């Protein structure tokens, strides 16, 4: 149904951004690392720096999706008659959300 | 030491291409779900392609880095004088290779 269809789009979405957040954080742990050892030089910190940046450029387009997938469920929402229960939608949307405003 | 440092920092990166790799894998098998269903809505269909164009932009600047990683590596190894076993050295740029090569 275009309505599960919908749904299972946004929840995709969402868990992508958790699979990349953790990249992200394991990434500034090991960068933290190399920036606390003084004895580092600094070409091996920059190769370090510099894949970090690359990791985090990708979040802001995830985001603005997040966002389009989510109004796009919102907007289907506010026209649907059909039978089925739309719990799931709206506790997809209230997820997707919950991120967009931490 | 330096030596440990170059070599963790490649086999991370050849780390994550698989993991990156997996994500892709997982997408074109709902998009290709998508595409067989002629009953679905060209703009939910839309959605899921376009997601799938950005995870794929991802992996190009990723195999960028693992030969500069890779090439660093070999450098440091031309020159090298130290008492450390190199085996785990020459099978980071052996596997970086064969990735970079398929």
Chains 1, 2 share one sequence.
Do not use: C, M, N, W
């Amino acid at each position: 149904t275009q309505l599960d269809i919908k749904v299972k789009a946004l929840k995709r979405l969402t868990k992508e951004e958790g699979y990349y957040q953790q990249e992200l954080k394991d990434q500034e742990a090991h960068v933290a690392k190399l920036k606390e050892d003084k004895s580092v030089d600094p070409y091996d910190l920059k190769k370090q720096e510099e894949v970090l940046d690359d990791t985090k450029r990708l979040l802001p387009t995830l985001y603005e999706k997040i966002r389009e997938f989510k109004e796009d469920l919102e907007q289907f929402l506010k026209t649907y008659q059909g039978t089925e229960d739309v719990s799931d939608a709206r506790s997809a949307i209230t997820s997707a959300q919950e991120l967009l405003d931490s």
